[PDB]
Amino acid sequence: MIMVNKKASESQVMELEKRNYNNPVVLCGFAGSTPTGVLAASYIVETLGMHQVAHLISQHIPPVAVFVGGKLRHPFRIYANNSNTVLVAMCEVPISSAHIYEISNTLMNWIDQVGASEIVIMEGSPANGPEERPVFAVAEKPKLDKFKKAGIQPADSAIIAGMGGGILNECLVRKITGLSFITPTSVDIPDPGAVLSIIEAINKAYNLKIKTDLLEEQVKALDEQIKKIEEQYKELQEKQKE
Amino acid sequence: MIMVNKKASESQVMELEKRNYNNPVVLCGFAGSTPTGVLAASYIVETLGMHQVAHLISQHIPPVAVFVGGKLRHPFRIYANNSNTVLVAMCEVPISSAHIYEISNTLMNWIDQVGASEIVIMEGSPANGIPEERPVFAVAEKPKLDKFKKAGIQPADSAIIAGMGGGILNECLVRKITGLSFITPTSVDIPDPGAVLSIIEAINKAYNLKIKTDLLEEQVKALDEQIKKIEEQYKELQEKQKE
Amino acid sequence: MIMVNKKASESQVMELEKRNYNNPVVLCGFAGSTPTGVLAASYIVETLGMHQVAHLISQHIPPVAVFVGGKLRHPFRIYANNSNTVLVAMCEVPISSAHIYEISNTLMNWIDQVGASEIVIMEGSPANGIPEERPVFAVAEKPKLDKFKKAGIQPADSAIIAGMGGGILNECLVRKITGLSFITPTSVDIPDPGAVLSIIEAINKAYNLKIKTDLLEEQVKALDEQIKKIEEQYKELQEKQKE
Amino acid sequence: MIMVNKKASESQVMELEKRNYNNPVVLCGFAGSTPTGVLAASYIVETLGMHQVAHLISQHIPPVAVFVGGKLRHPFRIYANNSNTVLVAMCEVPISSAHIYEISNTLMNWIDQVGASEIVIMEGSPANGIPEERPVFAVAEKPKLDKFKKAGIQPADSAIIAGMGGGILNECLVRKITGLSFITPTSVDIPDPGAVLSIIEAINKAYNLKIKTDLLEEQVKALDEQIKKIEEQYKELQEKQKE
Amino acid sequence: MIMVNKKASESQVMELEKRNYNNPVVLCGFAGSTPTGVLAASYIVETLGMHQVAHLISQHIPPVAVFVGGKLRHPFRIYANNSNTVLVAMCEVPISSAHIYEISNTLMNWIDQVGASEIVIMEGSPANGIPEERPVFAVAEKPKLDKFKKAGIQPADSAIIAGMGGGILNECLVRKITGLSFITPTSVDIPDPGAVLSIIEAINKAYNLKIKTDLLEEQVKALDEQIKKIEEQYKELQEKQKE
Amino acid sequence: IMVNKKASESQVMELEKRNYNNPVVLCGFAGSTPTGVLAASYIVETLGMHQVAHLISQHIPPVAVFVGGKLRHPFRIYANNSNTVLVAMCEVPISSAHIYEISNTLMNWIDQVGASEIVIMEGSPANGIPEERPVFAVAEKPKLDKFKKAGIQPADSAIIAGMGGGILNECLVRKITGLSFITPTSVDIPDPGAVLSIIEAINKAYNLKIKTDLLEEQVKALDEQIKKIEEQYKELQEKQKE
Amino acid sequence: IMVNKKASESQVMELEKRNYNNPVVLCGFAGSTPTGVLAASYIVETLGMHQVAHLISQHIPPVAVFVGGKLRHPFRIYANNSNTVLVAMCEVPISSAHIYEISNTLMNWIDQVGASEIVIMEGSPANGIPEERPVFAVAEKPKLDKFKKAGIQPADSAIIAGMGGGILNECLVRKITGLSFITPTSVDIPDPGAVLSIIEAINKAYNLKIKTDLLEEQVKALDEQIKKIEEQYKELQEKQKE
Amino acid sequence: MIMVNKKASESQVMELEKRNYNNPVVLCGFAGSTPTGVLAASYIVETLGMHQVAHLISQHIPPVAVFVGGKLRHPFRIYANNSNTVLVAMCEVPISSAHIYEISNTLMNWIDQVGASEIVIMEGSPANGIPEERPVFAVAEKPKLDKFKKAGIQPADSAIIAGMGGGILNECLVRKITGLSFITPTSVDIPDPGAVLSIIEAINKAYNLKIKTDLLEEQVKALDEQIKKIEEQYKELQEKQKE
């Protein structure tokens, strides 16, 4: 504990991390059953000009670099806007179910330490066919009423699994407000409408100003990429038995 | 050491936990082969008006949030009455058998600390029909068994005790806490409020708690809908995780 | 890890402390060569109606209980207002200079955690007469100094800053928290409520707290009796410990 | 705390490696789907007459000694030129995918403490194409991609990078060190010294080392005959271990 | 092991600190007998327009803040120039000799890891004068001493080298980093800018930094008054610090 | 501070090299052929060497050996009288999933004892054997050359696996001399000439003086013993799957 | 798991005895007489030995030595060419409050290097000296006897203090041979015959072959050097009390 | 976790000492105010021809080798008879009072793991009395005191026991092992072999060992001449160390 000590690390020798952030809302997109989560994440990070602020490092994140669209990056990234008032945590390769607890915990320590007020998990539930496309919420009773007024109804589901479950549990125990938006989404066609629903819901509920102009084609573009990787990883994972 | 102490934290930084409870009886219910334990537990948390008091955090509890009935909570909770004289430890999703030991050990460290007099594990065993004259049964050490037989609760008939109940009972055996279990035959497929009534009658009889049971058969009927919905989605979720 | 969490404990098991405070200004007062810091602190804790919120536990705080006025307390306390937007860190017995570093480091870990905006260390420097026109002075970084000069508070004149104030200020310098000190000339031997008034006027001016100062000169007068009685018994106790 | 201290071991006692390396570019050849990486790596070692400088020691490097061509060595080796400006790291047996993270990380620690400026992973993606327009493809961050494009080399057509290279690349990105990869198609069953030549050419252009490449196609074939020999015994070995 | 790693602090999660330093020469000034080391340190910090880069934290550095000339700062600071080719380590308050070893050792750990090539310790020896022919002495190793001798710098006369200079020299000798010291006679009663000027010229001759010396006498007299104020209030603190 | 018993000095002080005079260490492991461990036993017996240590580890089959009604631990080390020859043997096979660690424990101790050379003794499965039986070497070029003179020459193989692969790798990284002597040995039948070849090679490269009258007789007695155990260990592994 | 540089093997693997061929270690410490450390220097010079190690510790005066314009650490170890003789010397006095720990660090390394014998070299303050100067021994009975023949015989003293006391105690508990050669040496004046006596004893008990032409000349040059330093170290300790 | 394992070192690797000792009675002689304890101890070692069995190694045993009578040994030694039923622990130089606790504790660990049944501390309290009715006094717990009283020996007249013996005795009481002490008056300046004889007599009676005591007074005088020699050099030594 008699140490030399560098400026710029001041917030890590000290674990003083929350002071260079304004009590931010965190929006999350993980690569699970549908892609609307990480398409929403990528979209919003793009359009609000956010910059990267952190990576999450773990033996249990797949040790794979992503190079889709000829940009090289780490699969798990945390972005921030300039006011440090919104963060986006995204992850582009799926986390195997046996490691949700670990990754949720690592992520939520970092989020707790940064002073975040609210975590939003963004995702899409797969579906088969409307046009009036509903957004549903998992959330606690107070937050659920405020949402019903805005027309977002409670999700019809007894358990919440995936990274979403992990994080909500982490929230409940830590007493940070955590909730999730779900929107039905079509699996085998690009489905930009899904991402728009969510951004509307977010824009409203949180008063950000996510531009939504030319979302359809950005989203389409991303969605090719996100699928090329749903595939190359599905393959790899099976070949990885030799 | 050389720390700085916040208030509500004393019992925590000091492991001085027994201090804010009055020697409680702890009732337990887990999600196993029959729901009667979590139903009993939930009924009893409802009707005594208990408040939440703890979670039990662990990598080996399935990392699933529960949302049945649109109320969102963590699956493993501890509740207390206002007199902090009765606790309910409950868990709403199945605990895999590979982790009975870690989970039981984590629970029982907390319970040991809190200063509980007795651990009561509530459950039902799969039954077939079954008798209109529905008996409760005990697994306990000999002192308690002899006393319980003088209430018409007889010794369970099973060579070993498994599930979360055996893990808790082993920890009690080692820690020298009184630990027992109340088993009641319970119908595995159709709702069975009479099972919960038996367990609760047994508890009012043996601990002189005063658990209202007017519209228990109603209240329990509702809670079965729910607990079945998450058993069902959880088995589904696990089924998906296979192919 | 794989623990079990009690409620009011979250901020503790999670080091998630900033969460239940609203970015507070922390005012500090220690027992040094002049009492004005602990008097200011005590006045401000009294008149804002603050509640106790923490102790700071350490082998290097003299292990003495305080009992002046027949109210019994530990010598090192942290208080908050109801909005948790202002804290007062105070200590009623002298801190030996061999431990300024350990004590300052322990305080400032807690303060860092809580998420304080600024640390204000209140004190008086031994004076002789002194001016009827009683100035306050600042030790701060250049931004703050320039602002403060536009309130009529001028830079302190001292090459180094010692006591508990320099130790806190070094930690702030390293942690990049805003840390400053308000010094006022204060008469070392006769009671000096005007010193406390200056410090409090300076604080109302610079933080727009709203600290009533009707019958401050009374209330402070009483608290001087007391704080002098323990300075005096403590010096006595230490004198005894010598021969 | 208080040691005794031997001569050429300061690098070690003190973690003071960078001192003896002039910011080297590091080249990596790994046994995997296609042998072009290690061949590339040996050719460059043989031809720049590089000397061994280290070993990577792990439980997850297969515990097999290599003795092809009756010359006994460890499978995982690191070489330097004389000015310590170019390193070659290679491993002549393949690493199971369950351990890419740990090996990558061990290696990147070493490489980080050595003060490397750039890591280049040389690999060949398979096929039995094989057009002569056997081009070279880069995986790399945006600025560097510009260069190599202008320079005739263009983006790998890859959504993800797996293998040791995904590993090292993740490590590079996270540690803020330049990492890139060169890939060329390669004739999965036929020896394919063109592959190596394409790669050596891309390195010569890009880093202006100057690798003879005279009689490269002869040398690489001798080398291929050895590399396949161990892959063949390594697969034998591994099927034998299914009791 | 499984952290979240922040983008600004990668060099610190990773021990990756040599990476953002081009092999720097490190100059030191401590608060010894003469003031001439800290006066050089300060001078050069100002005149190369260096920027703050690190603090040295420790229980064994007087926990005192410096505020001379109304500039609040911590007593032990490390600066870098813009290319990160010259560092300056300075400490404005004296380190008790009981702690030479631990302070020297902390410093030399960071400096070894930053990749420093050569450490120069700047100092004065007390005189009263100084007959305008003022010499520079050196403690260095023979090969260095011999170069320096053609330069007019003669070998210090002392059988042993104490204070912080000796502690750093020992660390260097063991770590195999080149360490020397320059010493210049300096007047004890009256301010002595020519002491600082000679040391700066020593440095320019040895290392071809090209430190300027424009307005050096005026700048250094100004620093002298400041440093003197603190030498003096620090002695006063140490006298009082008894009770 | 810790009181301190007489004979354990070389243990408190890890001062263990002090009891041994620079030994060559010969090794025999249960592997494909059994000739390695047969040659260990025979030498342990004909040089009348005494036990000196055991290797203890969770990853040695926790099984006791009772062939020939002599009970022992499966992994043992012996030393001659002058502590100039050691013999390390292990009578039950080592799972390849643990080769590294068992190698590393072993090499650690060997390294600590000031060993000068490690010599792994192995047979290779043959259907054969040449009338004059060859012994081949795996070693570094300088040692391969001395041996070339002696008649022994390089083994023909690309990788060296088993415990020999692990030990050789340790010897390489530690900069200790490590080599291996292989001789073809017949799969089907007892092959005492196999052991007679390794001894002669050892007798001639290190000038120990291991006698060889009584070899065939004794090595045949032992071969029945090691077959019993191999046999019985395979049956045990079979059984364990429930 | 840890990558691993070439020359440091004997360090990662604590395999340090491997570089030295069983050395006798001779020691010289600043004490009462200076003859011990003068004899170290002279031998380090006449056998042209090379530095091999340093002892690092918070409890060696953190002071650098610059006598004769050669800068060094005060505690150093040297080895001849064949690594058969080491010399451990320390030019500044060691506070007796730390004798144990400095002894223990030193003996640890020495033990680890496979040292065979430790020989502490000391003078005892005399006003004298006998015309034929005696050298006395402290050692165990078997070694006292061999020496008895050689002319050397037991020191007359009840306890052995200084670093010699500490080192001898370590040597005893560790079961290593440790002895000490003492010779009366004159307090007031340079006493090169004192060093000439220790060498002859060493030359004759360990058959090193340290030359002795040039001894008086060189030992006198050194004695001026060590006096300067002793002198200056006493003055420093004086000063430190404020 | 997973070691290699040498022969006569099992006691050590496994903490398995008791196995090689038949429940020994342990006798302690310590250098202190009066030499009778160590003399007693040497006489009994010499005369039962006991062999050395251990050393106590510590930073707080004075780091001095003893060489009185030209026989070189460590100052702190433990001996056994052949049946390991009697141990003698002795220390021929005195232990400073700042370290009684740590040495006592080290020793009692060893003695505890060895399975000792009884610890007997033999000492002499000073005077220049010396009546022949040089009696022996016991310090001991109540039951044992009864015995030794009936046996002619009676309670030390002591309010507290200090020295190594207070240390060992505290350790004995806390660990529930029998500990006692035998004291006899002894002629602070005159050699006093009667002292030893009284003590040896009390042990022979009490434990029915059978210690020649033929020509004990001669032997003890030779021994005293040696013991005083080191006390004298040890005091010289120690006054010399006041720079």
PDB file of C-alpha atoms in Angstrom, chain D residues 131-243:
ATOM      1  CA  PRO D 131      -5.764 -19.790 -57.428  1.00  0.00           C
ATOM      2  CA  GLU D 132      -2.208 -18.131 -57.852  1.00  0.00           C
ATOM      3  CA  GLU D 133      -3.993 -15.055 -57.135  1.00  0.00           C
ATOM      4  CA  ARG D 134      -3.358 -16.711 -53.856  1.00  0.00           C
ATOM      5  CA  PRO D 135      -3.765 -13.365 -52.334  1.00  0.00           C
ATOM      6  CA  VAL D 136      -3.021 -12.294 -48.810  1.00  0.00           C
ATOM      7  CA  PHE D 137      -5.743 -10.922 -46.579  1.00  0.00           C
ATOM      8  CA  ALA D 138      -5.383  -8.680 -43.504  1.00  0.00           C
ATOM      9  CA  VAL D 139      -7.333  -8.688 -40.301  1.00  0.00           C
ATOM     10  CA  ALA D 140      -6.491  -5.450 -38.578  1.00  0.00           C
ATOM     11  CA  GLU D 141      -7.818  -2.222 -37.247  1.00  0.00           C
ATOM     12  CA  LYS D 142      -9.039   0.508 -39.622  1.00  0.00           C
ATOM     13  CA  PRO D 143      -5.953   2.732 -40.041  1.00  0.00           C
ATOM     14  CA  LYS D 144      -3.642  -0.289 -40.716  1.00  0.00           C
ATOM     15  CA  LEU D 145      -6.193  -1.803 -43.108  1.00  0.00           C
ATOM     16  CA  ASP D 146      -5.961   1.418 -45.207  1.00  0.00           C
ATOM     17  CA  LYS D 147      -2.184   0.995 -45.534  1.00  0.00           C
ATOM     18  CA  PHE D 148      -2.265  -2.706 -46.506  1.00  0.00           C
ATOM     19  CA  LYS D 149      -5.044  -2.023 -48.985  1.00  0.00           C
ATOM     20  CA  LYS D 150      -3.107   0.743 -50.670  1.00  0.00           C
ATOM     21  CA  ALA D 151      -0.357  -1.908 -50.290  1.00  0.00           C
ATOM     22  CA  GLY D 152      -2.269  -4.637 -52.334  1.00  0.00           C
ATOM     23  CA  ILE D 153      -3.649  -6.602 -49.316  1.00  0.00           C
ATOM     24  CA  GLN D 154      -7.268  -6.414 -48.262  1.00  0.00           C
ATOM     25  CA  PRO D 155      -9.759  -7.373 -45.522  1.00  0.00           C
ATOM     26  CA  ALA D 156     -10.172 -11.002 -44.555  1.00  0.00           C
ATOM     27  CA  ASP D 157     -13.753 -11.984 -45.336  1.00  0.00           C
ATOM     28  CA  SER D 158     -14.508 -13.078 -41.896  1.00  0.00           C
ATOM     29  CA  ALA D 159     -17.180 -12.348 -39.448  1.00  0.00           C
ATOM     30  CA  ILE D 160     -15.283 -13.737 -36.476  1.00  0.00           C
ATOM     31  CA  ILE D 161     -11.696 -14.731 -35.879  1.00  0.00           C
ATOM     32  CA  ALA D 162     -11.290 -17.878 -33.867  1.00  0.00           C
ATOM     33  CA  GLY D 163      -8.291 -19.983 -32.960  1.00  0.00           C
ATOM     34  CA  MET D 164      -5.205 -18.670 -31.201  1.00  0.00           C
ATOM     35  CA  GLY D 165      -5.447 -15.566 -33.373  1.00  0.00           C
ATOM     36  CA  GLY D 166      -8.865 -14.539 -32.083  1.00  0.00           C
ATOM     37  CA  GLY D 167      -7.248 -15.011 -28.706  1.00  0.00           C
ATOM     38  CA  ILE D 168      -4.153 -12.884 -29.273  1.00  0.00           C
ATOM     39  CA  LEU D 169      -6.203 -10.280 -31.152  1.00  0.00           C
ATOM     40  CA  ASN D 170      -8.676  -9.883 -28.261  1.00  0.00           C
ATOM     41  CA  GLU D 171      -5.787  -9.532 -25.917  1.00  0.00           C
ATOM     42  CA  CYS D 172      -4.196  -6.951 -28.239  1.00  0.00           C
ATOM     43  CA  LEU D 173      -7.285  -4.827 -28.518  1.00  0.00           C
ATOM     44  CA  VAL D 174      -7.919  -4.894 -24.787  1.00  0.00           C
ATOM     45  CA  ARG D 175      -4.298  -4.052 -23.913  1.00  0.00           C
ATOM     46  CA  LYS D 176      -4.068  -1.266 -26.574  1.00  0.00           C
ATOM     47  CA  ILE D 177      -1.226  -2.948 -28.540  1.00  0.00           C
ATOM     48  CA  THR D 178      -1.265  -3.238 -32.333  1.00  0.00           C
ATOM     49  CA  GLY D 179      -2.290  -6.708 -33.447  1.00  0.00           C
ATOM     50  CA  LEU D 180      -3.009  -7.952 -36.952  1.00  0.00           C
ATOM     51  CA  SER D 181      -3.226 -11.075 -38.957  1.00  0.00           C
ATOM     52  CA  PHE D 182      -2.285 -12.232 -42.410  1.00  0.00           C
ATOM     53  CA  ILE D 183      -4.211 -15.054 -44.074  1.00  0.00           C
ATOM     54  CA  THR D 184      -3.753 -16.860 -47.294  1.00  0.00           C
ATOM     55  CA  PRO D 185      -5.723 -19.848 -48.759  1.00  0.00           C
ATOM     56  CA  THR D 186      -3.918 -23.164 -48.492  1.00  0.00           C
ATOM     57  CA  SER D 187      -4.246 -26.651 -49.975  1.00  0.00           C
ATOM     58  CA  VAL D 188      -5.548 -28.648 -46.928  1.00  0.00           C
ATOM     59  CA  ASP D 189      -4.017 -31.949 -48.089  1.00  0.00           C
ATOM     60  CA  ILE D 190      -1.326 -30.995 -50.642  1.00  0.00           C
ATOM     61  CA  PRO D 191       1.944 -29.385 -49.295  1.00  0.00           C
ATOM     62  CA  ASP D 192       1.655 -25.765 -50.349  1.00  0.00           C
ATOM     63  CA  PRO D 193       4.863 -23.737 -50.105  1.00  0.00           C
ATOM     64  CA  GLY D 194       3.217 -21.023 -52.204  1.00  0.00           C
ATOM     65  CA  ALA D 195       1.205 -20.229 -49.070  1.00  0.00           C
ATOM     66  CA  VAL D 196       4.322 -19.563 -47.108  1.00  0.00           C
ATOM     67  CA  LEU D 197       5.772 -17.488 -49.939  1.00  0.00           C
ATOM     68  CA  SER D 198       2.675 -15.274 -50.178  1.00  0.00           C
ATOM     69  CA  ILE D 199       2.859 -14.633 -46.435  1.00  0.00           C
ATOM     70  CA  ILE D 200       6.647 -13.995 -46.359  1.00  0.00           C
ATOM     71  CA  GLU D 201       6.161 -11.549 -49.198  1.00  0.00           C
ATOM     72  CA  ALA D 202       3.418  -9.714 -47.324  1.00  0.00           C
ATOM     73  CA  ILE D 203       5.711  -9.336 -44.221  1.00  0.00           C
ATOM     74  CA  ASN D 204       8.686  -8.186 -46.265  1.00  0.00           C
ATOM     75  CA  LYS D 205       6.597  -5.477 -47.885  1.00  0.00           C
ATOM     76  CA  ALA D 206       4.951  -4.431 -44.677  1.00  0.00           C
ATOM     77  CA  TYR D 207       7.839  -4.536 -42.219  1.00  0.00           C
ATOM     78  CA  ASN D 208      10.703  -4.405 -44.572  1.00  0.00           C
ATOM     79  CA  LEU D 209      12.547  -7.227 -42.955  1.00  0.00           C
ATOM     80  CA  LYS D 210      14.326  -8.921 -45.719  1.00  0.00           C
ATOM     81  CA  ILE D 211      13.848 -12.565 -45.786  1.00  0.00           C
ATOM     82  CA  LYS D 212      16.010 -14.254 -48.347  1.00  0.00           C
ATOM     83  CA  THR D 213      13.161 -16.285 -49.982  1.00  0.00           C
ATOM     84  CA  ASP D 214      15.840 -17.824 -52.223  1.00  0.00           C
ATOM     85  CA  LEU D 215      15.068 -21.562 -52.427  1.00  0.00           C
ATOM     86  CA  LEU D 216      12.065 -21.051 -50.152  1.00  0.00           C
ATOM     87  CA  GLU D 217       9.935 -23.562 -51.967  1.00  0.00           C
ATOM     88  CA  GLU D 218      12.555 -26.268 -51.438  1.00  0.00           C
ATOM     89  CA  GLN D 219      13.077 -25.485 -47.740  1.00  0.00           C
ATOM     90  CA  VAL D 220       9.358 -25.199 -46.999  1.00  0.00           C
ATOM     91  CA  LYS D 221       8.737 -28.672 -48.485  1.00  0.00           C
ATOM     92  CA  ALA D 222      11.392 -30.261 -46.257  1.00  0.00           C
ATOM     93  CA  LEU D 223       9.695 -28.406 -43.370  1.00  0.00           C
ATOM     94  CA  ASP D 224       6.240 -29.541 -44.473  1.00  0.00           C
ATOM     95  CA  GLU D 225       7.330 -33.167 -44.433  1.00  0.00           C
ATOM     96  CA  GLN D 226       8.232 -32.693 -40.764  1.00  0.00           C
ATOM     97  CA  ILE D 227       5.215 -30.700 -39.728  1.00  0.00           C
ATOM     98  CA  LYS D 228       2.825 -33.268 -41.237  1.00  0.00           C
ATOM     99  CA  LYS D 229       4.702 -36.044 -39.526  1.00  0.00           C
ATOM    100  CA  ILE D 230       3.887 -34.682 -36.145  1.00  0.00           C
ATOM    101  CA  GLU D 231       0.329 -33.762 -36.950  1.00  0.00           C
ATOM    102  CA  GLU D 232      -0.031 -37.405 -38.018  1.00  0.00           C
ATOM    103  CA  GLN D 233       1.457 -38.821 -34.877  1.00  0.00           C
ATOM    104  CA  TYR D 234      -0.433 -36.280 -32.847  1.00  0.00           C
ATOM    105  CA  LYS D 235      -3.745 -37.428 -34.295  1.00  0.00           C
ATOM    106  CA  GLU D 236      -2.791 -41.147 -33.826  1.00  0.00           C
ATOM    107  CA  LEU D 237      -1.884 -40.349 -30.269  1.00  0.00           C
ATOM    108  CA  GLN D 238      -5.107 -38.600 -29.632  1.00  0.00           C
ATOM    109  CA  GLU D 239      -7.436 -41.281 -30.982  1.00  0.00           C
ATOM    110  CA  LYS D 240      -5.468 -43.869 -28.878  1.00  0.00           C
ATOM    111  CA  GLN D 241      -6.492 -41.779 -25.830  1.00  0.00           C
ATOM    112  CA  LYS D 242     -10.170 -42.722 -25.997  1.00  0.00           C
ATOM    113  CA  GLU D 243      -9.994 -45.234 -23.091  1.00  0.00           C
TER     114      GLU D 243
END
